[PDB]
Design a protein around this nucleic acid. Structure first.
Ligand SMILES: [Mg+2]
Ligand SMILES: [Zn+2]
Ligand SMILES: [Zn+2]
Lengths: 69, 1202, 98
DNA sequence: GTTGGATTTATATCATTTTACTAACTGATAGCGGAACTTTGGGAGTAAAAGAGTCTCCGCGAAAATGGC
DNA sequence: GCCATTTTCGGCCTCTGTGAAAAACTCCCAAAGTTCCGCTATCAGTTAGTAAAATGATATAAATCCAAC
């Protein structure tokens, strides 16, 4: 999780973001932004954070867009 | 749902509001139908139905009739669980005083109307009278009137006065009190009086009175008239087996109270004689006291088992009480436990989990997956397949386990590495397979230890386990920052045997293209593993700026080091391998790999080191034998000579030339030098051998003995154990501490006789008993430290302060104990670090010291640097990130919102089990104290200056002469005053002699303002001052141990911080334990939380009381911004026990210890706990304000700001 | 020994202790300290409430895991309510404010 | 290329089978209420005189917070 | 200020099962409990009946189309 903490900066904020994204994927039904490769939502969310597509700001903006829609 | 927890006195109106009915009779259950009877202790009307959605009479016996009360039985049809929430009450015939409010010293009834507890208890046990309404008589309130004296008073006044007796008298005395005017009486009385005892009593009583007026509680409520009754399932009466019943002692206590109250009512009905009524009231008071707190008022009431009954207090308090047994430590589901074995094939993030435990723990997940893929239609079918152990259940288990971390724990959990998250690999058998490299973190060895297994369930828990608790992320010790995954035992032996040099081995002098060629040569039985060769090594250096420079040269090495170079990652020198590798060398390999490569390369390298070490320790064939213990031939000659010289001193004692003590201390030295010489001879014989080189000469080689290799590799063993193996066991201590004159001259190889074995047992038993008591004491110390430091969380990034602590290398003579680089590694600077003799700003402000800046600060040779500290932090709650610095377990700056106090307490308390003028450097000399500085700016030597070869500035060359650890650590942390404190100078001034009055001596100090302060001095004190001399503040008056209190009072915060820091670090360093100073600084900051106000100023604080320092900072800042005058204080030092019981929150204080007085004070004062700490949030079950739960609480605070 | 869900104690409403009783492992004070040191607020909350004594919480969590949600709605521990009742029985008004 | 009978589609009416909704008999079974009888549960009473408690235990130490002077 | 008596603490896991003293009868009356029997409500089980709907079968009318003259 070194890449994830490098991209985020704080371990606790990284845990919060990853947990929120994993809950969205498991319950809401959002599709994975990265290839699954037979991985659980936790590892998928961590990989998405490491790549740089999922952050707190991105999640907040996406939620705002959904609420507007 | 809720934000705080208020505590206060329960008025009779409130008690009646809580209750759903009145309990009238002591009957519990019927003996035939086993049904509750009416108005009893288990009544179904008051407390609720026994069966779910039914009633006692059975008329309304289904859910359709919810909320409907039967007319026949009166039982509301609802769930049985309401019986654990419904309360009752008993209307006592006569008032009964609360036992806590009377014997929790100081008594809050005695100190609210100014009357001693002996007098009050004389009134309560119905022995004297007290006047309530004097009226127009000579008597006043509170006067004792003896029974005969009361008859005379009734004779000459009669109806004019009321002089009551018992708890009723207390109640109406407290009724007659007017708190406002009586507090004003305090206020006007304090200024007039001068005595300190009267003033202290007066302010204590004023504080209590003002608390009563502010809280809204009335003193009337101090005495009970209505007694609440607990829900029945909290005091159950249940059938164990075959008609036998199990009850709670609360039932017996309540039965006594009800029976005696009923008897009192009956006696009052019949107009009984006064003596019988009085005795009944006395027993009612005794029974209520035994119900509330048994064993306090008098002798403890015992049951039919001749054991004392357990009351309400005894079960809200203690180690076996509610707090510590059920609210702080809970038995949990989804848990398992098994014996641990070793898995040498595992990786760091993997642990071996048996399939039976995985099946039982992950059962709901298996059910979920079976339903979602449709193999099982419903939950019953899924349970059937799981129980039948079908084939597809195993594939489902291997899909659930795939990416689900599991928490492994070992008891005791001394530090945070005792619980770690692993990825499970499912195995046959019943034992958990553990990676060897984590055993040192668990203090776990495979002789029968068991570990607990916990399965996190929610997504947040899984992310926390994978991101924070993974064994891969936990490779550095939070106590010191050193790696904790360093190899031990077999790995070190294998890497040591592989990296050894043998003279004239097969294949010596060959030239090899690289590591692969060397591996090929050894696998082909061409070159021995210890053959000297020349190998072409390609090597990459990763500089500090990131430069990757590759190079290739021919290095003289061995085959083994060439092979080991295969697993070394790129970016490291070959000089790290081109040597024999003991434990320290491998630790340095891992340390530098982490420093220059990161974490992933480090964990892969650690795994590969482990596999290579295991493989080559296996291939080495190291075996211990009986010919490996080479007993030197000089041992017998040395024993004979020692015996001859002991006989010579034995025939010299009769000459009178020596005393008995001199003979003892000379025979001891004779044998304690024979031991050293035998040990040295054995080591010389065992560590060397003579071999034949290629030329044919005889050459000395380091030995390849099994025991020598075990000791030198550092795997397991040391010099002392070898000396007891093949040399001499040595002198031993008698059970009193004395040393037996005749030592044990035999080793374990040749065996001991009976007496020697007896003497050895004398010390073995002491060792075992001291290990056990040490474990107990260390546990208690760690608990106290955690309970004082549990509230320290990093709450900010920068507190914006300019204060700091200076640091220099530690000097205890002419040698350095620990350098400035070690001290300042990871601490943010406070002021700019100027170049020595220059105005260049070498290191700017607010920078974190990594190894790069450590190399800089070592190269430029600067001695003293100012860095931020936790003690000097200005944060209102907790500390800031910069004042703490680097997180040792992470390697970077501390994150916002992690419990640094708990880490500090665990780091300090973990090693408790292990706790038991010649000149040599060229340079100049100076007077400060005396200092000796080398050519550079480093001060090499420091010595004290007593009351003289060279003067100041004189250059000196080498050789030019000028002329119970754990109890100590606990003593320092509780700030215990020494037996003979060293007197210090309170004020700066001139010493002058007084008059040696009878008993002890007096002195006086003359201040610069002409004041003469009188100083009490014991006669035996060896005064170190002369009259006519101006002494400074804090100067030593009499030599001796220094209490921390007067250092704080007369020197300052930094002085006491340094004193505690080094006097705990000396205990730790003497034993070989490395603990960073930030932890002790955090504990000290928690120990300096309190201050006494001296100047009222414009603040509301009354001088003479203790208040928290943060409250005073807030008030002073507000008053300064308003412009009004601030408040002046004195900062006080409290022990780690008093500070914990003086916390603002009463729930944490009650959960620590001393529950009765904490709850009594909280209830009387009417406190409010805002739930702003770790322990209170643990008790109430919500998120802790640390770690992942930090931000959440912040938002709530934001929601409380708006 | 292994356990997911079994029998519970009468008063504390907490899992039993021992293999013979099919009990659960004890998460004592030092385990709580270790999780506080790590920063695992959510793991600590789960082990305190759902796994031990939150009566509605554990049933809801079992139902959610069977459904496949892996989310919890934590509630008040039962031992704290026992403590509140016991303190109230001593004539001391302890209460929760909103 | 043709044209008219017939050989199929087109539309409607009739008969058969089933559905929707009644009642009557059959047979039982549970529930409630009353009368009688036996069992249980509470209360009063006892008339040589008899006229001061247990209670075994009691193998703990260091430190601190409390009265009392 | 200083004794001098109370009060308060003393590590984590795991198994574990407790019965073990103690001395009255007697008479009278009221209420609960036990049991039996009768009335009443409530439902399964079965049969037969009547009107109506549904569905299929047949009838009646054309389209057109194809073969023979
Ligand atoms: Mg062991
Ligand atoms: Zn009812
Ligand atoms: Zn700070």
């Amino acid at each position: 999780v070194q890449d994830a903490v490098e991209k985020i900066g704080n371990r606790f904020d990284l845990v919060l973001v990853a947990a929120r994204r994993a809950r969205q994927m498991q319950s809401g039904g959002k599709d994975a932004l990265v290839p699954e490769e037979n991985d659980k939502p936790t590892v998928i969310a961590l990989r998405e954070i490491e790549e740089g597509l999922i952050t707190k700001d991105v999640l907040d903006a996406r939620e705002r867009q959904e609420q507007q829609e | 749902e809720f934000d705080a927890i208020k505590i206060g006195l329960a008025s009779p109106d409130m008690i009646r509001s809580w209750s759903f009915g009145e309990v009238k009779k002591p009957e519990t259950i019927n003996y035939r139908t086993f049904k509750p009877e009416r108005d009893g202790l288990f009544c179904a009307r008051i407390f609720g139905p026994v069966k779910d959605y039914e009633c006692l009479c059975g008329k309304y016996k289904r859910l359709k009739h919810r909320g409907v009360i039967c007319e026949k039985c009166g039982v509301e049809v609802t769930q049985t669980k309401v019986r654990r929430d419904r309360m009752g009450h008993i209307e006592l015939a006569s008032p009964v005083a609360h036992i806590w409010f009377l014997k929790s010293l100081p008594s809050r009834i005695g100190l609210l109307m100014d009357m001693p507890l002996r007098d009050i208890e004389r009134v309560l046990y119905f022995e004297m009278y007290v006047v309530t309404e004097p009226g127009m008589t000579d008597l006043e309130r509170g006067q004792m009137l003896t029974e005969e004296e009361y008859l005379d008073r009734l004779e000459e006044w009669g109806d004019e006065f009321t002089a009551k007796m018992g708890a009723e008298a207390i109640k109406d005395l407290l009724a007659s009190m007017d708190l406002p005017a009586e507090a004003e009486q305090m206020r006007e009385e304090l200024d007039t009086t001068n005595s300190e005892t009267k003033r202290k009593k007066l302010t204590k009583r004023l504080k209590l009175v003002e608390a009563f007026v502010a809280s809204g509680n009335k003193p009337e409520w101090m005495i009970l008239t209505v007694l609440p009754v607990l829900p029945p399932d909290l005091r159950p009466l249940v059938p164990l087996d075959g008609g036998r019943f199990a009850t709670s002692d609360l039932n017996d206590l309540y039965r006594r109270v009800i029976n005696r109250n009923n008897r009192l009512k009956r006696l009052l009905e019949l107009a009984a004689p006064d003596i019988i009524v009085r005795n009944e009231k006395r027993m009612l008071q005794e029974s209520v006291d035994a119900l509330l707190d048994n064993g306090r008022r008098g002798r403890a009431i015992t049951g039919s088992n001749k054991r004392p009954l357990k009351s309400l207090a005894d079960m809200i308090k203690g180690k076996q009480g509610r707090f510590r047994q059920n609210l702080l430590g809970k038995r949990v589901d989804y848990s398992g436990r098994s014996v641990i074995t070793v898995g040498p094939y595992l990786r760091l993030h993997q642990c071996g989990l048996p399939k039976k435990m995985a099946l039982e723990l992950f059962k709901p997940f298996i059910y979920s997956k079976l339903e979602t893929r449709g193999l099982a239609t419903t939950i019953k079918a899924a349970k059937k397949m799981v129980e039948r152990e079908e084939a597809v259940v195993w594939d489902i288990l291997d899909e659930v386990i795939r990416e689900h971390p599991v928490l492994l724990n070992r008891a005791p959990t001394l530090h945070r590495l005792g619980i770690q998250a692993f990825e499970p690999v499912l195995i046959e058998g019943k034992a958990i397979q553990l990676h060897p490299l984590v055993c040192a973190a668990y203090n776990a060895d495979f002789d029968g230890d068991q570990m607990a297994v916990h399965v996190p369930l929610t997504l947040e828990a899984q992310l926390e386990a994978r991101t924070l608790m993974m064994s891969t992320n936990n490779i550095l010790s939070p106590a010191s920052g050193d790696p904790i995954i360093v190899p031990s035992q077999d790995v070190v032996l294998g890497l040591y045997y592989m990296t050894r040099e043998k003279i004239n081995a097969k294949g010596e002098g060959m030239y090899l293209t690289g590591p692969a060629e060397a591996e090929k040569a050894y696998r082909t039985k061409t070159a021995e593993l210890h053959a000297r060769v020349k190998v072409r090594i390609t090597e990459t250096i990763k500089h500090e700026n990131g430069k990757l420079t590759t190079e290739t040269k021919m290095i003289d090495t061995t085959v083994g080091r060439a092979m080991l170079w295969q697993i070394v990652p790129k970016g490291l020198p070959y000089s790290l391998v081109n040597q024999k590798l003991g434990k320290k060398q491998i630790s340095n390999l891992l340390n530098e790999a982490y420093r220059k490569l990161g974490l992933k390369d480090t964990v892969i390298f650690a795994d590969q080191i482990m596999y290579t070490g295991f493989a080559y320790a296996a291939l080495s064939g190291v075996s211990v034998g009986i010919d490996d213990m080479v007993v030197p031939a000089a041992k017998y000659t040395e024993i004979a000579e020692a015996e001859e010289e002991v006989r010579e001193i034995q025939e010299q004692f009769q000459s009178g030339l020596v005393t008995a003590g001199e003979r003892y201390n000379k025979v001891i030295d004779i044998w304690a030098s024979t031991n050293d010489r035998v040990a040295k001879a054995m080591m010389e014989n065992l560590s060397s051998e003579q071999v034949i080189n290629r030329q044919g000469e005889q050459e000395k080689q380091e030995s390849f003995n099994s025991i020598y290799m075990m000791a030198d590799s550092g795997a397991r063993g040391s010099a002392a154990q070898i000396r007891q193996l093949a040399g001499m066991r040595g002198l031993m201590a008698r059970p009193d501490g004395s040393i037996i004159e005749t030592p044990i001259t035999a080793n374990f190889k040749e065996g001991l006789n009976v007496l020697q074995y007896f003497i050895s047992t004398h010390g073995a038993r002491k060792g075992l008993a001291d290990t056990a008591l040490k474990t107990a004491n260390s546990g208690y110390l760690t608990r106290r430290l955690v309970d004082v430091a549990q509230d320290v969380v990093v709450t900010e990034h920068d507190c914006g302060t300019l204060e700091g602590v200076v640091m220099t290398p530690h000097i205890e003579g002419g040698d350095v104990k620990v350098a400035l680089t070690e001290l300042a590694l990871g601490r943010v600077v406070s002021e700019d670090i100027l170049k020595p003799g220059t105005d260049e700003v070498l290191i700017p402000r607010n920078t974190l010291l990594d190894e790069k800046w450590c190399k800089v600060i070592n190269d430029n040779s600067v001695d003293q640097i100012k860095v931020r500290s936790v003690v000097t932090c200005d944060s209102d709650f907790g500390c800031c990130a910069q004042c703490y610095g680097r997180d040792l377990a992470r390697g970077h700056l501390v994150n916002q919102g992690e419990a640094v106090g708990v880490i500090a307490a665990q780091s300090i308390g973990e090693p408790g089990t292990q706790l038991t003028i010649q000149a040599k450097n060229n340079g100049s000399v100076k007077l400060h104290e005396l200092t000796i500085i080398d050519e550079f700016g480093r001060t090499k030597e420091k010595h004290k200056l007593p009351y003289l070869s060279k003067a100041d500035g004189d250059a000196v060359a080498a050789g030019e002469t000028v002329a119970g650890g754990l109890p100590r650590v606990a003593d320092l942390f509780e700030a215990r005053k020494p037996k003979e404190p060293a007197i210090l100078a309170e004020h700066s001034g001139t010493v002058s002699f007084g008059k040696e009055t009878k008993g002890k001596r007096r002195l006086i100090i003359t201040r610069d303002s002409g004041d003469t302060y009188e100083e009490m001095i014991p006669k035996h004190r060896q005064l170190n001052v002369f009259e006519g001399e101006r002494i400074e503040r804090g100067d030593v008056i009499a030599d001796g141990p220094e209490s921390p209190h007067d250092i704080l009072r007369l020197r300052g915060i930094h002085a006491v911080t340094t004193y505690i820091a080094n006097e705990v670090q000396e205990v730790y360093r003497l034993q070989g334990v490395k603990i960073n100073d930030k932890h002790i600084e955090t504990i000290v900051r928690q120990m300096l939380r309190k201050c006494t106000i001296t100047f009222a100023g414009d603040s509301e604080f009354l001088p003479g009381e203790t208040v928290e320092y943060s409250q005073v900072k807030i008030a002073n800042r507000k008053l300064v911004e308003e412009g009004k005058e601030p408040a002046r204080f004195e900062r006080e030092l409290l022990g780690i026990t008093k500070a914990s019981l003086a916390t603002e929150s009463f729930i944490s204080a009650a959960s620590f210890q001393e529950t009765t007085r904490v709850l009594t004070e909280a209830a009387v004062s009417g406190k409010r706990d805002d739930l702003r700490g770790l322990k209170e949030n643990v008790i109430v079950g919500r998120l802790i304000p640390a770690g992942t739960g930090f931000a959440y609480h912040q938002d709530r605070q934001a929601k409380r700001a708006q | 020994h292994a356990r997911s869900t079994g029998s519970y104690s009468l008063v504390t409403q907490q899992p039993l202790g021992g293999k013979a009783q099919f009990g659960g492992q004890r998460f004592g004070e030092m385990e709580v300290w270790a999780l506080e040191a790590y920063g695992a607020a959510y793991t600590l909350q789960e082990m305190l409430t759902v796994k031990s004594d939150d009566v509605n919480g554990r049933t809801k969590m079992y139902k959610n895991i069977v459904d496949g949600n892996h989310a919890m709605e934590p509630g008040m521990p039962e031992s704290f309510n026992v403590l509140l009742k016991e303190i109230r029985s001593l004539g001391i008004n302890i209460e929760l404010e909103d």
